[PDB]
Structures are given as C-alpha cells and as structure tokens.
Amino acid sequence: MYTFVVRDENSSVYAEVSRLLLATGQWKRLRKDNPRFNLMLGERNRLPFGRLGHEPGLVQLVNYYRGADKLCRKASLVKLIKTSPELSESCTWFPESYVIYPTREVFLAAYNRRREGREGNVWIALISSEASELLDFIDEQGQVHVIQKYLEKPLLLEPGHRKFDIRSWVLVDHLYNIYLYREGVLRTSSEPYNSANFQDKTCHLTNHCIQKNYGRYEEGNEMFFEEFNQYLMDALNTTLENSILLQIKHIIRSCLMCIEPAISTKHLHYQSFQLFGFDFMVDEELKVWLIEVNGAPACAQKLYAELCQGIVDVAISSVFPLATSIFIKLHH
C-alpha cells in the first residue's frame, strides 16, 4: 500500500486525484504533517522541498517543480524570456513586454515609437492606450506589474464576433516527459468584441469568472476542441492541428526545455512532477501567442475525470505501480 498526504485543500485537480487514489485500495491518506508519505500534494506557497527525500525506506514524489515559479509568475516569465538565449530576445511567439515598479524607461522607448508611427498602441496590466494613464493602477496597488503589448487584431468567431483565449494543460513527469492533454478548451467572450473604448470589461478579457450571456453560444462559455476544429474547417479551410496546435506544441516545448536544467529532479533525492496551464492568444493570421503560464491551474468541469485519471497513469502510477493515451508526448 502506497501512502500520500494532502497539503492544499483548494486544489480541485488534486481533490479529484486523492479521490481516485483512495478508490484504488492501494493508497492510504495520512495526516498532512506525517513525514512518512510516498507522495505529497503540497501547498502552493512555501512548499518545504528541503524536507523531501530524507525518509529512508520511502521513495518520495511531489506534484510541484521547485523553481517552476520562474514560468508561472508574470514578472519572472518576462525576465526569463528576455535573458535566456534559448528564447531571447525576440521569439516570434511572446508579446513585447516590460516589467514595471511603483517605487519603465525602456517601455517608453518603444511607446514613443508606437504613437508617432500611428501603430497600434494598446497595452495591458488594466487596459488603455496612454502610458501614464495606467500608472494610477500600478501605483495605488503597490505590486510589481507587467505592461504588455495588447493584441489589437485577434481572431473572432462567428456568429458572435466573440473573443477567446486557449488553455492547454501540460503534465511534466519525473522523467521530464512533456505530456500535452489532447483536450484543450476555448475560454470564450459572450458579448461582441468592440475596439472603440477599452474599459468595457466583459468583452476584452476572457477569465471564466469574469463573465458572471453566460452560456449563449455553448454551455459555460466553453468550446471543446472538436467544435472549434470543425469551425476552422468550415469557416477558414484548415485544421486546429495545422493552424494553431503546431505553434502551441512548439511554445510548450521551448518554455519547458529552457528551464529543464534548473528544475529537473532526475538525479535528485526526491522526485517532481507538475501540471501546468499554458494560456495562448490566437491573432488575425492564425498566429499563436503565449500569454501566461499557470502553476496551479484548474480544469474545465467536463475534462476533470479524464485528465485526473491520466495524472495517475502517467505521473503517479509510473513511480508507484499497481496490480489509448490521452496525452500527446512532446518529444525532445
């Protein structure tokens, strides 16, 4: 009988993973501060990696990668991409971004470019077209914020003239295999897109909670991959795999291969895996852009069952065996 603990109770994904584990008959759940665990579904802040891998007679595994925050925190992602030769400076797939502090100089270098050439000059934190206007947001909050080029020409769906972002779930196992769940989701905007005034909230930003038209064109404002692939065929004469997914697989591979030296647990005394949420923006010419990477992501209500079962098959049961694949392996 294998043994695990649960140190983050907000986890919808790993709430469903401990259920599946317990319902195997081969996994016991201990008290969250019991050191003699095989597997740790750990907290999100100040996870004590230093105490992993020092229990003799126990192979220990954890559902987070130490150092992975470098991708999943808006400020460091921008830093990582500009400084790492594996990506920097200008990779075709990241929006020109700058890091700002409320206690800035290079931002104004390209901003003074983008108004005197009439080029599009909308940016984001939140949104507007004048630089100093959004510093009121930056300065009355008190945190380090990132100012990023707003993608003024996105790809809208019909009927609806709606806006969207693509979320892809990626699982990285203890061997550093990169598994991309075959089921992505299109978080959609219900109310039409309007490029006139950028303070109309609901229609420019596509967070699922920031839309509570909720359910007009499809349940929950979620468009699975089958329906979106069909739409691209009928409307634009192309597939999801060719127009969009090749670029998504390329970006996921590039991001995670970049940090592999800093976070891999191949020779470590404890082992890591982590589920990620890559959020992409597709523009007018079927061009994929990376927005953010999410370290503790949630799954759509439909795909919970299937994705969490594959977390077990691929990341947990591979290390602790018991007794078709839903993942596409991104090879390296």
């Binding site: 990696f49 230093g50 105490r51 020092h54 003799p56 130490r66 020779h267």
Partner: protein, 437 residues
C-alpha cells in the same frame, strides 16, 4: 611555519580522528611507530607537514592531536590499535561515564569536571608551537559529548586563545546511522552555543556519506569504518593545503577569507568525486571535466541539498592527481554554460583552484579504488540551509510537547536555553534566506 592542533571529541570525533591520522601517515610516509624516513631533518623542522606533526629527538613524528571522550571504550581502541605508538598517552583523555546522549549532561554536569584537565593537556601541545595557528575540532552534533562538551570547550578556547582560528568538522545526525532520538535537541543546542566561536565549519551529513557508500561502493549496510575512511578522504583534501607546499589556503585564517564572507554563514558545502569501488574489476578513469562536473551533482555532496535554488558566496576546487590548469578552465567553461550557478551580486563569479600533483592515497585493503585524479569542491551556498530547516523542524516537533526536556532540566539547564537556541537557529535560517533570494 605555523602549527595546527586537532581536537577530537566524543565517539564520532575520535573514530574520525583515527581515520584521518591513519591517512595522514600514509600520505606523508610516516610509519605506525612514528618514524619518517623521508624526513632528513632529525628532531625538528619548519616543513609543511610539521603543521600537524611534532618531532622527538629519537626521530618520532607525533600528531599535534588530543583525543577527548567522556568514556574510555573508544579511545581505549586507539591506545591498543595499530597506531598505539604514534600518540603520547597524555593526548588520550577519557572519563568514566558518558553524557548519555544528553547535551546538558555533557556540557554542564560532567563537562565541568574534565574541562580544566583538557585545557591543560591542550596547553601542553600549544607550548610546543612557535606560532600556533588554531584548532581543528572533530565531533558529532548528536552525541551528548560531541554536542555538550565541544560547546564548552569551544567557549574556553576563545578566552585562552582569542587570536587563534577554530575550524569544525561536524557530523550531522541521520536516522539510518543515529544512536539517539534526541539528536535534534543536541544539534540545535550545540550549534547555538558554538556559532560565535567557530570561524568555519564543514558539516558532514551521515545520510550523504551512507548513500555514497551504498551507491558508489556497493556496500549494502555501511559501517562506521566505511563512512569514516570516506570522510577522512574529504578531510584530507581540505587540510592538504596546510600539510603540503602550495599557495592556496596555507593558514586557517585563509579558509575564512576565501570561504566565509559573513561570520555566521560559515558552513561551506563539500562535494567530492570520484568515489569508485576497490572491488570494481573494470574502471574507466574519469577526466578533469568529468570529476569537475560531479562537483555539481547533489549525490556527491557531503550534505544533500539543491545548490541550483540558492546562491554562492565562494567556491574552491581542490584537485589531487594528474590535473593542469588548462583542463580545469576548459571544464569550468563548459559547466557554467550547462548548469545553474548563481552568485550573490556582491561577490565575483569565480573559482579559487588549488592543485596537488600527488594523487589521493587510499588505505590498503580499503573500499576506495586508487584514481588518477580527484577533486573536493568547497562551496558556500545558501542551499545548505535546507539542512538547518530539516533539523529545526524535527526540533520543533518534539519541543512543542516538551518531550525529553526533563532529562536536560534535570542536569541543570533551564528550559529557556532550548528556546534561545531555537531562536538563534531561526535567525540563522532568516540570514540564509536574505542572502539567497
């Protein structure tokens, strides 16, 4: 030349002292009876090995060493062992009842009755020194003597020898080899009381040495004899600069200069490679690049931790064997482009390199194979703080219930010294985090 006196306290300290002095003799060609044919200056000299050995008129080379334990069993093995003749009997100091794995009994109750005797025996070696450098103190964190008596000795050495450096080789407690359930208590108490009295301390986690013996020596359940001969190898490469001709770390003062920019953060991480089994029928001898690369794999460290998630303040490479600077710089050039080596912003990103052409020695019929070249890396990384976190958490788990605390109060300690020690640990962890993020 300037002499160094070694002090071995408790079982771990004494047994590791045997290991080291056996090895020192084989490296300097000193025989078990103390004779050294290579030495042509009879009765004295200012040679480099004279830092660790005095000379009798009869040609005998005697360690500038003292062995102290609160209990005769272990030092009795030195008195009758292969190196029986090596040691003046006044350097082997034993008591009658040990500290029973209790820091307070070692520090207060029993320590107070032997401390003056030990300092007089230490004073008798110091009076044979033309320019004493300082002390090297070997001891366990976990033993009652190793913790309790070392602590009190360290305070006294500060008053009697305030202008002399003190280095530790400290054995950090590991359950696979530990002998007592209270070793976290002892570790925290003795680190607190000793911290201001040690200039540089090399921690050796018995868990790291155990797995290295299992993994790279194919020893199913390592003995102390297995662990200590490996440890002695690491200690030898750290002290070699004091015992041989060279330009790098020639005196104890230079260890602090090169390795410890801040006084409290004086725990450098040791990494050693290659560790190859003697029973291996076929070995492909590892290159300068291969062994320098091993220095950045956690599995070769004296303490398991991940230096990728900390910052460096200093880093020395001590090579022994067939090594030339051309190959070191070539290897360093490759490693930095393929590894996460980040220094504090207030330190240069550089390696201080020392090379001794004599390849490492191995004790005949030991577990280590003879290799063409070897390296010990000394890096001072915030990553080591993981060990303080591990130790402190175990301390917190028992001290929340006051478990076993009665054994210490009963020897004269006050409960408050537990919390004072723990707060200093808390301060130490916060210092490492400031420097390292």
């Amino acid at each position: 030349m300037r002499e160094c006196i070694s002090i071995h306290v408790g079982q771990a300290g004494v047994q590791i002292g045997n290991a080291c002095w056996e090895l020192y003799c084989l490296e300097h060609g000193i025989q078990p009876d103390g004779q050294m044919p290579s030495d042509k200056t009879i009765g004295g000299g200012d040679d480099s090995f004279n830092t660790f050995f005095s000379e009798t008129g009869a040609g005998k080379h005697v360690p500038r060493a003292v062995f102290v334990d609160l209990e005769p069993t272990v030092i009795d093995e030195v008195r009758t062992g292969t190196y029986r003749q090596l040691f003046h009997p006044e350097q082997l100091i034993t008591g009658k009842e040990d500290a029973a794995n209790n820091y307070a009994r070692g520090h207060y109750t029993i320590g107070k009755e032997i401390i003056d005797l030990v300092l007089d025996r230490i004073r008798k070696l110091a009076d044979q020194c033309t320019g004493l450098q300082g002390f090297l103190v070997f001891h366990s964190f976990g033993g009652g003597t190793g913790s309790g008596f070392t602590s009190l000795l360290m305070e006294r050495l500060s008053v009697d020898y305030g202008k002399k450096s003190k280095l530790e080789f400290s054995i950090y407690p590991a359950p696979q080899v530990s002998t007592a359930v209270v070793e976290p208590y002892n570790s925290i108490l003795t680190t607190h009381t000793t911290l201001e009295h040690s200039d540089c301390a090399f921690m050796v986690d018995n868990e790291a040495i155990y797995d290295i013996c299992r993994r790279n020596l194919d020893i199913e359940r390592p003995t102390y004899t297995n662990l200590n001969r490996l440890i002695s190898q690491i200690v030898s490469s750290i002290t070699a600069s004091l015992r041989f001709d060279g330009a790098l770390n020639v005196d104890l003062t230079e260890f602090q200069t090169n390795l410890v920019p801040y006084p409290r953060i004086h725990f450098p991480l040791a990494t050693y490679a290659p560790v190859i089994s003697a029973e291996k029928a076929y070995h492909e001898q590892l290159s300068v690049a291969e062994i320098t690369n091993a220095c950045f794999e956690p599995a070769n460290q004296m303490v398991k931790c991940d230096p990728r998630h900390g910052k460096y303040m200093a880093c020395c490479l001590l090579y022994r064997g067939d090594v030339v600077p051309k190959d070191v710089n070539a290897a360093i050039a490759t490693i930095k482009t393929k590894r996460s080596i980040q220094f504090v912003d207030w330190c240069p990103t550089g390696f201080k390199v020392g090379i001794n052409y004599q390849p490492p020695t191995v004790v005949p019929g030991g577990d280590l194979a003879k290799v063409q070249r070897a390296v010990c890396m000394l890096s001072n990384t915030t990553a080591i703080a993981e060990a303080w976190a591990r130790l402190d958490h175990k301390f917190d788990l028992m001290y929340a219930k006051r478990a076993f605390v009665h054994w210490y109060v009963g020897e004269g300690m006050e409960e408050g010294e537990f919390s004072e020690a723990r707060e200093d640990m808390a301060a130490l962890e916060k210092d490492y985090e400031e420097v390292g993020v």
